[PDB]
Point group: D2
Chain length 111, copies 4
Protein backbone atom coordinates (compact mmCIF):
# COMPACT_ATOMS: atom_id res chain seq x y z
CA UNK A 1 0.00 0.00 0.00
CA UNK A 2 2.97 2.35 -0.72
CA UNK A 3 2.93 3.44 -4.37
CA UNK A 4 5.84 5.88 -4.38
CA UNK A 5 7.40 3.70 -7.07
CA UNK A 6 4.29 4.31 -9.21
CA UNK A 7 4.17 8.03 -8.39
CA UNK A 8 7.73 8.68 -9.49
CA UNK A 9 7.34 6.53 -12.58
CA UNK A 10 4.81 9.16 -13.61
CA UNK A 11 7.15 11.94 -12.40
CA UNK A 12 9.98 10.58 -14.54
CA UNK A 13 7.60 9.88 -17.43
CA UNK A 14 5.84 13.28 -17.53
CA UNK A 15 8.00 15.95 -15.93
CA UNK A 16 5.06 18.30 -15.09
CA UNK A 17 1.55 16.93 -14.41
CA UNK A 18 -1.48 18.09 -12.45
CA UNK A 19 -4.99 16.70 -12.07
CA UNK A 20 -7.91 16.83 -9.66
CA UNK A 21 -10.84 14.44 -10.02
CA UNK A 22 -12.50 15.35 -6.69
CA UNK A 23 -16.22 14.90 -7.50
CA UNK A 24 -18.53 17.95 -7.36
CA UNK A 25 -22.09 16.62 -7.66
CA UNK A 26 -24.54 19.17 -8.99
CA UNK A 27 -28.05 18.89 -7.60
CA UNK A 28 -31.22 19.86 -9.44
CA UNK A 29 -34.43 21.79 -8.86
CA UNK A 30 -35.89 19.05 -6.70
CA UNK A 31 -32.79 18.66 -4.56
CA UNK A 32 -33.13 14.88 -4.32
CA UNK A 33 -32.01 14.75 -7.92
CA UNK A 34 -28.36 14.71 -8.99
CA UNK A 35 -28.08 16.42 -12.36
CA UNK A 36 -24.35 16.61 -13.13
CA UNK A 37 -20.79 15.87 -12.03
CA UNK A 38 -17.88 18.31 -12.22
CA UNK A 39 -14.13 17.59 -12.12
CA UNK A 40 -11.85 20.53 -11.15
CA UNK A 41 -8.88 19.60 -13.36
CA UNK A 42 -9.19 16.66 -15.79
CA UNK A 43 -6.39 15.01 -17.71
CA UNK A 44 -6.08 16.54 -21.15
CA UNK A 45 -3.41 14.40 -22.80
CA UNK A 46 -6.21 12.63 -24.76
CA UNK A 47 -9.78 13.39 -25.86
CA UNK A 48 -11.50 11.40 -23.07
CA UNK A 49 -15.20 10.54 -23.04
CA UNK A 50 -17.39 9.47 -20.12
CA UNK A 51 -19.77 6.54 -19.56
CA UNK A 52 -22.46 6.71 -16.87
CA UNK A 53 -23.94 3.70 -15.05
CA UNK A 54 -27.17 4.39 -13.15
CA UNK A 55 -27.91 1.68 -10.57
CA UNK A 56 -26.25 -0.99 -12.68
CA UNK A 57 -27.76 0.32 -15.90
CA UNK A 58 -25.38 1.35 -18.67
CA UNK A 59 -26.38 4.81 -19.91
CA UNK A 60 -23.70 4.73 -22.59
CA UNK A 61 -21.15 7.27 -23.74
CA UNK A 62 -21.86 10.77 -25.03
CA UNK A 63 -19.86 13.64 -26.49
CA UNK A 64 -17.79 15.47 -23.91
CA UNK A 65 -18.13 19.07 -22.88
CA UNK A 66 -15.07 21.21 -23.61
CA UNK A 67 -12.57 21.58 -20.81
CA UNK A 68 -13.03 25.12 -19.53
CA UNK A 69 -10.47 27.85 -18.83
CA UNK A 70 -9.88 26.70 -15.25
CA UNK A 71 -9.23 23.14 -16.41
CA UNK A 72 -12.58 21.80 -15.22
CA UNK A 73 -14.80 19.35 -17.04
CA UNK A 74 -18.48 18.68 -16.44
CA UNK A 75 -20.57 15.57 -17.09
CA UNK A 76 -24.23 16.39 -17.60
CA UNK A 77 -26.29 13.37 -16.53
CA UNK A 78 -29.30 14.91 -18.31
CA UNK A 79 -27.48 14.13 -21.58
CA UNK A 80 -27.38 10.45 -20.56
CA UNK A 81 -30.72 9.98 -18.78
CA UNK A 82 -33.17 11.22 -21.44
CA UNK A 83 -33.42 14.80 -20.18
CA UNK A 84 -33.73 13.86 -16.49
CA UNK A 85 -31.37 13.83 -13.56
CA UNK A 86 -30.63 10.75 -11.47
CA UNK A 87 -32.32 10.32 -8.10
CA UNK A 88 -29.99 10.46 -5.10
CA UNK A 89 -31.37 7.12 -3.88
CA UNK A 90 -29.62 5.48 -6.87
CA UNK A 91 -25.91 4.70 -7.28
CA UNK A 92 -24.01 6.46 -10.07
CA UNK A 93 -20.70 5.33 -11.55
CA UNK A 94 -18.74 7.42 -14.05
CA UNK A 95 -15.97 5.88 -16.18
CA UNK A 96 -13.43 7.58 -18.45
CA UNK A 97 -13.19 5.87 -21.83
CA UNK A 98 -9.66 5.89 -23.17
CA UNK A 99 -10.00 6.62 -26.93
CA UNK A 100 -6.77 4.80 -27.83
CA UNK A 101 -7.53 1.27 -26.58
CA UNK A 102 -11.15 1.64 -25.43
CA UNK A 103 -10.27 0.99 -21.78
CA UNK A 104 -12.48 2.29 -18.97
CA UNK A 105 -11.42 3.55 -15.54
CA UNK A 106 -13.81 4.37 -12.69
CA UNK A 107 -13.33 8.05 -11.82
CA UNK A 108 -16.43 8.84 -9.69
CA UNK A 109 -19.11 6.98 -7.74
CA UNK A 110 -22.15 8.18 -5.78
CA UNK A 111 -23.62 6.10 -2.91
Amino acid sequence: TNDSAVLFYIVASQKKLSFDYTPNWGRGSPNSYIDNLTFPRVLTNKPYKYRVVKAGQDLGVRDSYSVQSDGSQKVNFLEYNAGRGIADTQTIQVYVVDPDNGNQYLVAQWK
Copy 2:
Protein backbone atom coordinates in the same frame (compact mmCIF):
# COMPACT_ATOMS: atom_id res chain seq x y z
CA THR B 1 10.45 4.32 -21.92
CA ASN B 2 11.29 2.19 -18.82
CA ASP B 3 8.59 0.62 -16.64
CA SER B 4 10.75 -1.39 -14.20
CA ALA B 5 9.50 0.86 -11.41
CA VAL B 6 6.01 -0.52 -12.18
CA LEU B 7 7.24 -4.14 -12.37
CA PHE B 8 9.04 -3.91 -9.03
CA TYR B 9 6.05 -2.16 -7.45
CA ILE B 10 4.08 -5.30 -8.32
CA VAL B 11 7.00 -7.41 -7.00
CA ALA B 12 6.71 -5.57 -3.68
CA SER B 13 2.93 -6.18 -3.45
CA GLN B 14 2.69 -9.67 -4.96
CA LYS B 15 6.03 -11.42 -4.90
CA LYS B 16 4.68 -14.20 -7.19
CA LEU B 17 3.15 -13.44 -10.59
CA SER B 18 2.57 -15.51 -13.73
CA PHE B 19 0.35 -14.85 -16.74
CA ASP B 20 0.23 -15.38 -20.50
CA TYR B 21 -2.34 -13.44 -22.52
CA THR B 22 -0.82 -14.33 -25.89
CA PRO B 23 -3.83 -14.38 -28.22
CA ASN B 24 -4.54 -17.76 -29.81
CA TRP B 25 -7.19 -17.11 -32.45
CA GLY B 26 -8.98 -20.30 -33.50
CA ARG B 27 -10.46 -20.20 -37.00
CA GLY B 28 -13.71 -21.74 -38.18
CA SER B 29 -15.16 -24.00 -40.84
CA PRO B 30 -14.15 -21.55 -43.56
CA ASN B 31 -10.62 -20.67 -42.50
CA SER B 32 -11.55 -16.96 -42.94
CA TYR B 33 -13.89 -17.07 -39.90
CA ILE B 34 -12.48 -16.48 -36.38
CA ASP B 35 -14.43 -18.56 -33.87
CA ASN B 36 -12.67 -18.19 -30.51
CA LEU B 37 -9.75 -16.87 -28.43
CA THR B 38 -7.57 -18.80 -25.96
CA PHE B 39 -5.22 -17.32 -23.32
CA PRO B 40 -2.55 -19.78 -22.09
CA ARG B 41 -2.39 -18.53 -18.50
CA VAL B 42 -4.91 -15.91 -17.28
CA LEU B 43 -4.96 -14.00 -14.01
CA THR B 44 -7.13 -15.68 -11.38
CA ASN B 45 -7.12 -13.25 -8.42
CA LYS B 46 -10.66 -12.17 -9.44
CA PRO B 47 -13.51 -13.82 -11.44
CA TYR B 48 -13.04 -11.87 -14.67
CA LYS B 49 -15.56 -11.67 -17.49
CA TYR B 50 -14.98 -10.62 -21.08
CA ARG B 51 -16.47 -8.02 -23.41
CA VAL B 52 -16.22 -8.43 -27.19
CA VAL B 53 -16.43 -5.56 -29.68
CA LYS B 54 -16.88 -6.50 -33.38
CA ALA B 55 -15.77 -3.66 -35.68
CA GLY B 56 -16.69 -1.00 -33.13
CA GLN B 57 -19.94 -2.81 -32.24
CA ASP B 58 -20.44 -3.87 -28.62
CA LEU B 59 -21.37 -7.57 -28.43
CA GLY B 60 -21.71 -7.34 -24.67
CA VAL B 61 -20.48 -9.50 -21.82
CA ARG B 62 -21.14 -13.22 -21.34
CA ASP B 63 -20.52 -15.73 -18.59
CA SER B 64 -16.95 -17.01 -18.77
CA TYR B 65 -15.73 -20.54 -19.40
CA SER B 66 -13.91 -22.21 -16.52
CA VAL B 67 -10.18 -21.68 -16.11
CA GLN B 68 -8.72 -24.97 -17.29
CA SER B 69 -6.22 -27.03 -15.33
CA ASP B 70 -3.24 -25.71 -17.30
CA GLY B 71 -4.31 -22.11 -16.49
CA SER B 72 -5.91 -21.57 -19.89
CA GLN B 73 -9.15 -19.74 -20.54
CA LYS B 74 -11.24 -19.61 -23.68
CA VAL B 75 -13.45 -16.87 -25.10
CA ASN B 76 -15.99 -18.39 -27.50
CA PHE B 77 -17.03 -15.67 -29.95
CA LEU B 78 -19.96 -17.81 -31.08
CA GLU B 79 -21.34 -17.01 -27.62
CA TYR B 80 -21.02 -13.26 -28.39
CA ASN B 81 -22.02 -13.16 -32.09
CA ALA B 82 -25.10 -15.43 -31.91
CA GLY B 83 -23.40 -18.65 -32.94
CA ARG B 84 -21.36 -17.25 -35.85
CA GLY B 85 -17.66 -16.43 -36.10
CA ILE B 86 -16.12 -13.09 -37.05
CA ALA B 87 -14.68 -12.64 -40.54
CA ASP B 88 -10.94 -11.89 -40.72
CA THR B 89 -11.95 -8.60 -42.42
CA GLN B 90 -13.54 -7.22 -39.21
CA THR B 91 -11.79 -5.91 -36.09
CA ILE B 92 -12.44 -7.76 -32.83
CA GLN B 93 -11.48 -6.32 -29.42
CA VAL B 94 -11.63 -8.27 -26.15
CA TYR B 95 -11.65 -6.51 -22.78
CA VAL B 96 -11.28 -7.97 -19.34
CA VAL B 97 -13.99 -6.63 -16.98
CA ASP B 98 -12.85 -6.13 -13.41
CA PRO B 99 -15.84 -7.33 -11.31
CA ASP B 100 -14.81 -4.98 -8.42
CA ASN B 101 -15.00 -1.55 -10.09
CA GLY B 102 -16.28 -2.29 -13.58
CA ASN B 103 -13.06 -1.20 -15.27
CA GLN B 104 -12.28 -2.61 -18.69
CA TYR B 105 -8.83 -3.46 -20.00
CA LEU B 106 -8.14 -4.50 -23.60
CA VAL B 107 -6.32 -7.85 -23.70
CA ALA B 108 -6.62 -8.94 -27.36
CA GLN B 109 -7.23 -7.35 -30.75
CA TRP B 110 -7.26 -8.59 -34.35
Copy 3:
Protein backbone atom coordinates in the same frame (compact mmCIF):
# COMPACT_ATOMS: atom_id res chain seq x y z
CA THR C 1 2.75 1.57 -25.27
CA ASN C 2 0.09 3.57 -23.36
CA ASP C 3 0.28 4.25 -19.61
CA SER C 4 -3.17 5.79 -19.14
CA ALA C 5 -4.00 2.84 -16.90
CA VAL C 6 -1.24 3.93 -14.51
CA LEU C 7 -2.46 7.54 -14.54
CA PHE C 8 -6.02 6.53 -13.69
CA TYR C 9 -4.85 4.12 -11.04
CA ILE C 10 -3.41 7.23 -9.34
CA VAL C 11 -6.66 9.14 -9.85
CA ALA C 12 -8.41 6.29 -8.04
CA SER C 13 -5.76 6.09 -5.30
CA GLN C 14 -5.40 9.85 -4.68
CA LYS C 15 -8.11 12.01 -6.18
CA LYS C 16 -5.74 15.07 -6.41
CA LEU C 17 -2.08 15.08 -7.50
CA SER C 18 0.08 17.95 -8.67
CA PHE C 19 3.81 18.14 -9.31
CA ASP C 20 6.47 19.79 -11.47
CA TYR C 21 9.99 18.30 -11.40
CA THR C 22 11.30 20.38 -14.36
CA PRO C 23 14.98 20.97 -13.50
CA ASN C 24 15.99 24.54 -12.72
CA TRP C 25 19.79 24.31 -12.50
CA GLY C 26 21.34 27.13 -10.50
CA ARG C 27 24.74 28.27 -11.72
CA GLY C 28 27.57 29.60 -9.58
CA SER C 29 30.04 32.45 -9.36
CA PRO C 30 31.98 31.09 -12.33
CA ASN C 31 29.09 30.52 -14.69
CA SER C 32 30.35 26.99 -15.46
CA TYR C 33 29.59 25.87 -11.88
CA ILE C 34 26.27 24.22 -11.01
CA ASP C 35 25.56 25.00 -7.34
CA ASN C 36 21.96 23.91 -6.78
CA LEU C 37 18.84 22.48 -8.39
CA THR C 38 15.26 23.54 -7.79
CA PHE C 39 12.01 21.67 -8.50
CA PRO C 40 8.98 23.95 -8.92
CA ARG C 41 6.45 21.64 -7.17
CA VAL C 42 7.72 18.52 -5.38
CA LEU C 43 5.65 15.69 -3.95
CA THR C 44 4.86 16.27 -0.29
CA ASN C 45 3.29 13.01 0.97
CA LYS C 46 6.61 12.14 2.71
CA PRO C 47 9.74 14.05 3.75
CA TYR C 48 11.85 12.72 0.88
CA LYS C 49 15.65 12.99 0.86
CA TYR C 50 18.00 13.42 -2.08
CA ARG C 51 21.10 11.55 -3.25
CA VAL C 52 23.49 13.26 -5.67
CA VAL C 53 26.08 11.37 -7.67
CA LYS C 54 28.73 13.57 -9.34
CA ALA C 55 30.12 11.73 -12.40
CA GLY C 56 29.50 8.25 -11.06
CA GLN C 57 30.74 9.26 -7.59
CA ASP C 58 28.26 8.95 -4.71
CA LEU C 59 28.18 12.18 -2.71
CA GLY C 60 25.60 10.60 -0.40
CA VAL C 61 22.20 11.47 1.00
CA ARG C 62 21.36 14.69 2.91
CA ASP C 63 18.27 16.24 4.50
CA SER C 64 16.00 18.23 2.26
CA TYR C 65 15.56 21.92 2.55
CA SER C 66 12.01 22.76 3.65
CA VAL C 67 9.36 22.80 0.94
CA GLN C 68 8.80 26.45 0.18
CA SER C 69 5.54 28.40 0.26
CA ASP C 70 5.12 27.99 -3.51
CA GLY C 71 5.71 24.24 -3.19
CA SER C 72 9.22 24.31 -4.66
CA GLN C 73 12.17 22.51 -3.18
CA LYS C 74 15.88 23.01 -3.82
CA VAL C 75 18.86 20.69 -3.50
CA ASN C 76 22.05 22.64 -2.64
CA PHE C 77 25.03 20.69 -4.02
CA LEU C 78 27.44 22.59 -1.77
CA GLU C 79 26.00 20.57 1.12
CA TYR C 80 27.13 17.46 -0.82
CA ASN C 81 30.45 18.62 -2.33
CA ALA C 82 32.33 19.94 0.73
CA GLY C 83 31.31 23.58 0.23
CA ARG C 84 32.07 23.85 -3.51
CA GLY C 85 29.89 23.56 -6.60
CA ILE C 86 30.14 20.92 -9.32
CA ALA C 87 31.59 21.98 -12.66
CA ASP C 88 29.07 21.87 -15.49
CA THR C 89 31.57 19.57 -17.26
CA GLN C 90 30.60 16.54 -15.17
CA THR C 91 27.35 14.58 -15.16
CA ILE C 92 25.01 14.93 -12.17
CA GLN C 93 22.18 12.58 -11.18
CA VAL C 94 19.73 13.33 -8.37
CA TYR C 95 17.79 10.54 -6.72
CA VAL C 96 14.78 10.75 -4.48
CA VAL C 97 15.07 8.54 -1.40
CA ASP C 98 11.76 7.21 -0.08
CA PRO C 99 12.23 7.31 3.74
CA ASP C 100 10.01 4.29 4.45
CA ASN C 101 11.52 1.56 2.22
CA GLY C 102 14.79 3.24 1.15
CA ASN C 103 14.00 3.01 -2.58
CA GLN C 104 15.61 5.54 -4.91
CA TYR C 105 14.09 7.14 -8.01
CA LEU C 106 15.95 9.30 -10.55
CA VAL C 107 14.28 12.71 -10.88
CA ALA C 108 16.95 14.85 -12.55
CA GLN C 109 20.13 14.40 -14.59
CA TRP C 110 22.61 16.87 -16.07
CA LYS C 111 24.71 16.54 -19.27
Copy 4:
Protein backbone atom coordinates in the same frame (compact mmCIF):
# COMPACT_ATOMS: atom_id res chain seq x y z
CA ASN D 1 -7.35 -1.92 -5.72
CA ASP D 2 -4.42 -2.17 -8.19
CA SER D 3 -5.76 -4.33 -11.03
CA ALA D 4 -5.34 -1.36 -13.39
CA VAL D 5 -1.57 -1.57 -12.84
CA LEU D 6 -1.55 -5.37 -13.39
CA PHE D 7 -3.29 -5.24 -16.74
CA TYR D 8 -0.84 -2.53 -17.77
CA ILE D 9 1.92 -5.12 -17.33
CA VAL D 10 -0.20 -7.64 -19.28
CA ALA D 11 -0.75 -5.13 -22.06
CA SER D 12 2.95 -4.27 -22.42
CA GLN D 13 4.33 -7.84 -22.18
CA LYS D 14 1.81 -10.47 -23.26
CA LYS D 15 3.70 -13.22 -21.31
CA LEU D 16 5.60 -12.71 -18.02
CA SER D 17 6.42 -14.75 -14.90
CA PHE D 18 8.45 -13.94 -11.81
CA ASP D 19 8.69 -14.97 -8.17
CA TYR D 20 10.63 -12.95 -5.61
CA THR D 21 9.39 -14.95 -2.62
CA PRO D 22 12.45 -14.76 -0.31
CA ASN D 23 14.19 -18.05 0.50
CA TRP D 24 16.63 -17.29 3.32
CA GLY D 25 19.62 -19.64 3.57
CA ARG D 26 20.95 -20.30 7.07
CA GLY D 27 24.55 -20.79 8.16
CA SER D 28 26.75 -23.15 10.12
CA PRO D 29 25.58 -21.69 13.43
CA ASN D 30 21.86 -21.45 12.69
CA SER D 31 21.84 -17.86 14.05
CA TYR D 32 23.17 -16.68 10.67
CA ILE D 33 21.62 -15.72 7.35
CA ASP D 34 24.08 -16.59 4.61
CA ASN D 35 22.10 -15.95 1.45
CA LEU D 36 18.77 -15.13 -0.16
CA THR D 37 17.23 -17.00 -3.08
CA PHE D 38 14.52 -15.75 -5.40
CA PRO D 39 12.74 -18.64 -7.17
CA ARG D 40 12.21 -16.86 -10.53
CA VAL D 41 13.75 -13.44 -11.24
CA LEU D 42 13.15 -10.90 -13.96
CA THR D 43 15.86 -11.20 -16.60
CA ASN D 44 14.95 -8.44 -19.09
CA LYS D 45 17.96 -6.57 -17.63
CA PRO D 46 21.14 -7.68 -15.86
CA TYR D 47 20.03 -6.53 -12.43
CA LYS D 48 22.48 -6.24 -9.56
CA TYR D 49 21.70 -6.35 -5.86
CA ARG D 50 22.64 -4.00 -3.04
CA VAL D 51 22.65 -5.12 0.60
CA VAL D 52 22.21 -2.89 3.65
CA LYS D 53 23.08 -4.58 6.97
CA ALA D 54 21.54 -2.74 9.94
CA GLY D 55 21.72 0.69 8.31
CA GLN D 56 25.15 -0.07 6.82
CA ASP D 57 25.50 0.05 3.03
CA LEU D 58 27.52 -2.99 1.90
CA GLY D 59 27.50 -1.88 -1.72
CA VAL D 60 26.92 -3.71 -4.99
CA ARG D 61 28.46 -6.93 -6.34
CA ASP D 62 28.27 -8.77 -9.65
CA SER D 63 25.19 -10.94 -9.66
CA TYR D 64 25.33 -14.72 -9.55
CA SER D 65 24.26 -16.54 -12.66
CA VAL D 66 20.55 -17.10 -13.06
CA GLN D 67 20.22 -20.83 -12.55
CA SER D 68 18.46 -23.24 -14.92
CA ASP D 69 15.19 -23.14 -12.96
CA GLY D 70 15.13 -19.32 -13.23
CA SER D 71 16.40 -18.62 -9.69
CA GLN D 72 19.06 -16.13 -8.64
CA LYS D 73 20.92 -16.01 -5.37
CA VAL D 74 22.47 -13.19 -3.33
CA ASN D 75 25.40 -14.48 -1.21
CA PHE D 76 25.85 -12.30 1.88
CA LEU D 77 29.35 -13.67 2.36
CA GLU D 78 30.29 -11.74 -0.80
CA TYR D 79 29.00 -8.53 0.79
CA ASN D 80 30.02 -9.16 4.42
CA ALA D 81 33.69 -10.17 3.93
CA GLY D 82 33.29 -13.94 3.98
CA ARG D 83 30.94 -13.94 6.97
CA GLY D 84 27.18 -14.38 7.26
CA ILE D 85 24.90 -11.78 8.83
CA ALA D 86 23.60 -12.44 12.34
CA ASP D 87 19.82 -12.73 12.38
CA THR D 88 19.60 -10.01 15.05
CA GLN D 89 20.59 -7.46 12.38
CA THR D 90 18.40 -5.90 9.67
CA ILE D 91 19.03 -6.89 6.05
CA GLN D 92 17.71 -4.97 3.04
CA VAL D 93 18.15 -6.15 -0.55
CA TYR D 94 17.62 -3.69 -3.39
CA VAL D 95 17.47 -4.37 -7.07
CA VAL D 96 19.51 -1.85 -9.06
CA ASP D 97 17.99 -0.93 -12.35
CA PRO D 98 21.05 -0.82 -14.62
CA ASP D 99 19.41 1.72 -16.93
CA ASN D 100 18.68 4.62 -14.56
CA GLY D 101 20.43 3.59 -11.32
CA ASN D 102 17.10 3.26 -9.47
CA GLN D 103 16.87 1.00 -6.46
CA TYR D 104 13.81 -1.00 -5.41
CA LEU D 105 13.53 -3.03 -2.20
CA VAL D 106 12.86 -6.75 -2.90
CA ALA D 107 13.70 -8.36 0.44
CA GLN D 108 13.88 -7.42 4.11
CA TRP D 109 14.81 -9.41 7.23
CA LYS D 110 13.10 -8.58 10.59
